[PDB]
Design a protein around this ligand. Sequence first.
Ligand SMILES: CN[C@H](CC(=O)O)C(=O)O
Length: 268
Amino acid sequence: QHLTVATLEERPFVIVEPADPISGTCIRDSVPCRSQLNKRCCKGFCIDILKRLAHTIGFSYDLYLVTNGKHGKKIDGVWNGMIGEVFYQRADMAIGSLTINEERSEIVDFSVPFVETGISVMVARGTTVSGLSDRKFQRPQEQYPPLKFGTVPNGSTEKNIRSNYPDMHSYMVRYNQPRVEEALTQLKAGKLDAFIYDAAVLNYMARKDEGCKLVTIGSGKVFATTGYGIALHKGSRWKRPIDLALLQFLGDDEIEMLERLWLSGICH
Ligand SMILES: CN[C@H](CC(=O)O)C(=O)O
């Protein structure tokens, strides 16, 4: 009846803000969230999902922001990030822009996916590349000044590229970005020619770009389609109620409403 939930900031799925200085509380559609290191309030698409699950299923929760890495990476036998919090049973569940992949699915249970995603590439509107099938990407060191392109490492995007396109991955390493905000800054400054990342996030960023100067190209057949899912302990008794609720939200057009509310933009 009381769940500990791990999350991670990734706008607009999870957005972190200070408490209202006037009231010292979380007002509007926000909820209290503390840091794993230990005030702060969280809102966004995934938080609205969490609020609805809590109400529909009938649990209370304690929400915290992960500081031990980000989404989840396995290094030398040990998981960090949201996946690690769930895998090591520090949290009952983790929710945010958490991408379902084979590696993670082996060790945690995932809810049914509630956001469709995958991998896409974002470029400046003028930049002449065809997409991720382009040799500028695929054979990066075959030309005069090489194309500069990178990702934010340590997550499902990098894992997918390393597994499927190890030569391209080795090239991208020097262009790793610390977060999406910095990657976008480098794209606009021409320090990167392309940014390869989660499709749901990139599409949102392109829809919100000032001047509509950034465009995304879907990866097509280069990478598979997947989804965000809620991570739970392997064998969790929470998987079924959560799945049924999510499936219900989908059919009630509640998820579509949340998409309109949180993910809509101006550019097309
Ligand atoms: C939005 N997904 C994150 C970051 C990434 O895909 O690289 C992840 O699940 O790892």
